[PDB]
Amino acid sequence: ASFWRAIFAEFFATLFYVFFGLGASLRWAPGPLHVLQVALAFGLALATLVQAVGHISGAHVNPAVTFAFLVGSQMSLLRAICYVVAQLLGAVAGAAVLYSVTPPAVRGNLALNTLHPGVSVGQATIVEIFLTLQFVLCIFATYDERRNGRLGSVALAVGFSLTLGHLFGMYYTGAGMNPARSFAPAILTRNFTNHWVYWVGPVIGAGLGSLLYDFLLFPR
């Protein structure tokens, strides 16, 4: 069905998203401003994924993004669930493989998300709300076919927005803005410290970004 082809896509696109994005954050011999590289990593991992599976499922690849669409009333509460599951499964998968191919000495924390020292959970949450609010907003914007012409590549758009979020919040929360991205390493590394910040944040940010876009900026 055009559903399982869509659920499949979400599993594989999230798998690749965590493999690549997380793979890249596996700071081998980076150094300073490594944030630039990783951000472009996640950002181009998305743009690319969205370019292959943007038509098969919308390429959410992010439980929080699927959430935004659910509240945004663009997904049946049934489908939204299959995505979040496929995503979390694809995610842990992508992280397992990256783990298998990556030398033990390099795969440090497996790129687990952690609140940067000195950054509280309330802040870490506000930040993650913002990293994802602007991200969801962008998505809601670009994907909203009610606008074209000088629009441009939708996939590079949404991707750069992910890169934005990273360029900024990498320093605070290691930039999760994706429950699935944060979950995969948390389960494997078995470290769930401050993990909720990584769900509350993106879910609120996501929802809020959905409503802000809908009810307000550009309503229905």
Place this chain on the structure above:
Amino acid sequence: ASFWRAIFAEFFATLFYVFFGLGASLRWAPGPLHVLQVALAFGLALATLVQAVGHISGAHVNPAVTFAFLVGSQMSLLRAICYVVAQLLGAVAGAAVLYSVTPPAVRGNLALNTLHPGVSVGQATIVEIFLTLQFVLCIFATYDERRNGRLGSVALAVGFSLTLGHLFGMYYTGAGMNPARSFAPAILTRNFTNHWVYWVGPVIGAGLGSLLYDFLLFPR
């Protein structure tokens, strides 16, 4: 007494050693090869400390070094204990102050020692044995007044040896080569993960370095 002046010195010199050495590893905006800076940090922290309290107590400032002297039969099992206590107290003190003066966002882990990913505990232990074996050896060597002339500054010697150990083992075990240096942050940060590696290692390395120097290289 020339004892409490010696025990006092050990408490204050270890306090400063952990304040400074650990202070410096509080990677603010370092970047790559930060190991160079930190190593010189610990190394010059030692050379300096040894230059002020080298005559008041020998400037062990390292439970493992005091151990080497104990087995090396150069300290009464009573004194050796007072040093290890003064050291561990000075250490946790030095770390508490560094903590108070350091912004929350900078004092990350408080420079806690951790085995670099991919490095087992057996290896981490071998490494720490070596970082300290050469270190103790150097000390036993320089402090052994049975040699002078082209010797040179004893404090810069012993210090550079500490810098050596860091230049190398920082990458593996974060270079502890000092039970007290590893203890202070472990207790405050309350993180005692793999902490034993940091005692077993330096204690064996220390002892072994003591015996190697004594029974062999340059006996009694």
